[PDB]
Amino acid sequence: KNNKSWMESEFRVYSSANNCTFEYVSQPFLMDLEGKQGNFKNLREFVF
Amino acid sequence: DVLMTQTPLSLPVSLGDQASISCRSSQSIVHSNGNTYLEWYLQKPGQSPKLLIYKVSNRFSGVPDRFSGSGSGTDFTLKISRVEAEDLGVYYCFQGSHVPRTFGGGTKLEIKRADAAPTVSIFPPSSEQLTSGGASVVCFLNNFYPKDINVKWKIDGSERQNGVLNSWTDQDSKDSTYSMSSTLTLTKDEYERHNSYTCEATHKTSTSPIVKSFNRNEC
Amino acid sequence: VFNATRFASVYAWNRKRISNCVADYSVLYNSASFSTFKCYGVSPTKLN
Amino acid sequence: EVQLLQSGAELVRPGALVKLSCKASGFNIKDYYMHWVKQRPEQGLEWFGWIDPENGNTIYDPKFQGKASITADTSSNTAYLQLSSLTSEDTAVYYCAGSGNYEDAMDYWGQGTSVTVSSAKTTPPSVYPLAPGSAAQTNSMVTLGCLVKGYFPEPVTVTWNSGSLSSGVHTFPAVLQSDLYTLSSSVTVPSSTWPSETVTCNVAHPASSTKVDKKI
Secondary structure, three states: OOOOOOOOOOOOOOOOOOOOOOOOOOOOOOOOOOOOOOOOOOOOOOOO | OOOEEEEOOEEEEOOOOOEEEEEEEOOOOEOOOOOEOEEEEEEOOOOOOEEEEEOOOEEOOOOOOOEEEEEEOOEEEEEEOOOOHHHOEEEEEEEOOOOOOEEOOOEEEEEOOOOEOOEEEEEOOOHHHHHHOEEEEEEEEEEEEOOOEEEEEEEOOEEEOOOEEEEEOOOOOOOOOEEEEEEEEEEHHHHHOOOEEEEEEEEOOEEEEEEEEEEHHHO | OOOOOOOOOOOOOOOOOOOOOOOOOHHHHOOOOOOOOOOOOOOHHHHO | OOEEEOOOEEEEOOOOOEEEEEEEEOOOHHHOOEEEEEEEOOOEEEEEEEEOOOOOOEEEOOOOOOOEEEEEEOOOOEEEEEEOOOOHHHOEEEEEEEOOOOOOOOOEEOOOEEEEEOOOOOEOOEEEEEOOOOOOOOOOEEEEEEEEEEEEOOOOEEEEHHHOEOOOEEEOOOEEEOOEEEEEEEEEEEOOOOOOOOOEEEEEEOOOOEEEEEEO
16 A cells, blocks of 8 residues: 555464574565566576 | 654543544555555543544444544544443554554543532541551542542641542543542651641632641541 | 583583584684693594 | 453562463454553553464564563464563553454454552551541531552452442542552432431452441
């Protein structure tokens, strides 16, 4: 609505975590989650 | 850290009249979808707050039809088409949004009636209490409206504040008036060392405080 | 780790997993800041 | 009507902690947010924080950060607020809110819990009568009082003539002072009754098992 927000509110990814053998965090940044109208302006391709 | 102010602080409305409580916010919460994240509440005397209107423009389920919210930008008001006795309480504004939630100062609602000044009477300490080693002067104030009132105690014409306890009651279900008690706590030496005690009542309906006095030997 | 505010009890000794980082052992072994130091099976110089 | 059940009141000494329960009734707590509030008579309502039972995320107001933690019990659909490191300023009535009906617009509030930070211990009341003195204190109706002082915790059941007298009977809320409560009661009766007909004030304090019958 107003106060567009578009920021993380709920965390349903996983209920809990007990043992962690690895961790990594990137630098702070800000990504625009605001919706857009029209065609798809971004393309992301990943190989794992 | 949202800042908001509720106006008026209190307002008396007679049965069948309309009540208007307004709130001003330091952040815009008006939305283009027709809803406004500001919830209205009513806290009846001795009960917890109960939701009245959600998102301003949408009435809460189970609430009487008389309750409806409206406004825009940062100024919003709650309108009651017809007010009743059960509407007594304090009305609060509750901003929503995705930020730490904030509360307002509250607005008090009273049922209007013919204004009346308090009736002041004082009871001297009991003989048993004096024998035990204590003393208590009790001042009773009854049948006054509006609720706003204050009491101060004087001993031999000197203002006394220590040991003064004031307790107010709810609006009478029959006379629609208010009553309260004012008790001055004293020791036996303190009570006997003084002769005159006065109960002064400051009320909005009387420019001069209502004064009642008694002497120690009159017990 | 060696200067932490508190340590666990001998019976409650903590088991901490160290990974996803680099270790600079030159400052530790060669600083002579510790009363006693010994190694079993491998010399301290080789471990570096 | 969806309601939240909380403990009536709590007595905690300074520096100790309390745990306020909030049991869901008529809804599943897992599908709705839970909120907590602090209220005192001088400032009004003060927002405490919110918790998501299904996500586990919690947000606390800076005024209460480091003083409390919010959790809930999924099995019993009960929300808990822990209030620790309490002082005199923390004496307040705490409420819980939730059950927004699958929308971030509504909520339901419980009766609230009165949390008092004090060292007061259960003390029986001291009951004395307030009888007329000089004959000048006479009107068309006779007003008689009954004072209850020096008790804890509030309230004290005060009535007149064992409950058979109710016209003109008024009892006032207790006031806390120096770890003790004080209240007064008065009744106005026709001049044809007093002093011909005895008017008695009955004071009962179940917390201390104290019962006093004082005649006037």
